[PDB]
Amino acid sequence: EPWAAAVPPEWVPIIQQDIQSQRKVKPQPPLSDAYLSGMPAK
């Protein structure tokens, strides 16, 4: 994994785990009014 050479060594297991976790299908439910209210607006 080339990416592992690029980051601090102590980050590597964390990122490895997170790469695996993100493989799991977990669809985001429709985003709340509250969350979307933080979107950019003119």
Added chain:
Amino acid sequence: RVEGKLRASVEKGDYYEAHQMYRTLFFRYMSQSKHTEARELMYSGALLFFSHGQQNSAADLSMLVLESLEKAEVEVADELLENLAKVFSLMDPNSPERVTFVSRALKWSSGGGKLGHPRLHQLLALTLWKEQNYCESRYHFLHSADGEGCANMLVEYSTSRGFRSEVDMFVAQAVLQFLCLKNKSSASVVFTTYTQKHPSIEDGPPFVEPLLNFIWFLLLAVDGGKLTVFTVLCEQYQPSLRRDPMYNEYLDRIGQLFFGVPPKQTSSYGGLLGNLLTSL
């Protein structure tokens, strides 16, 4: 002196009459270059009308406070900002006048730099938070230097109004937007405060939530000036970053601002919503 006589007219309920007399003396003092006396009288008059529920007159006198500040080319000072935020807090939250006042007060506070002064933004945000107008509070916190207040507000907002699937997203959204304003200090503080104080986030870093590790690592990479690290992080956390369509656009902007990488996303939800340069 004259304040005594005007105050008596308001207390008698002659609001229209007192209002026009305040205006008369304002323009008279202004014509005589007595800008300070003009502002002081209008401010005390505004407060007096607010105490009687006379919002339209109070708001009008509040605009004349700003007229004096503008004409006299007064600079920001703590007392002036606190005065302007006090008047803001007394205005009807559902009046176009409050919108008008805020816009004009922030413009004055910029010393037309043209960014509204961050202490005024902070004061506004605090009021708006107390009023549970979280959407507007957040906007002003983002233009403030107050990451810690922002975080505490967002904990309340996320738990009160957000969904349980969004707990990590609210802090990601705030950090990324602070960084788009090149404010890495507040970005770090909002992250640290939010993750520690939020009831649904356990001890960390590292965190169980990948999006939170991404944001933690991103702050370290930006503060260290490490472009190669930044690039790896954005690549390996794409599944998390796709949860908000705008995250990759914020990261394009952040890459540009901190490292000079030309923006990569061909897509522009920004354009749809408002262009990122001019809609944060």
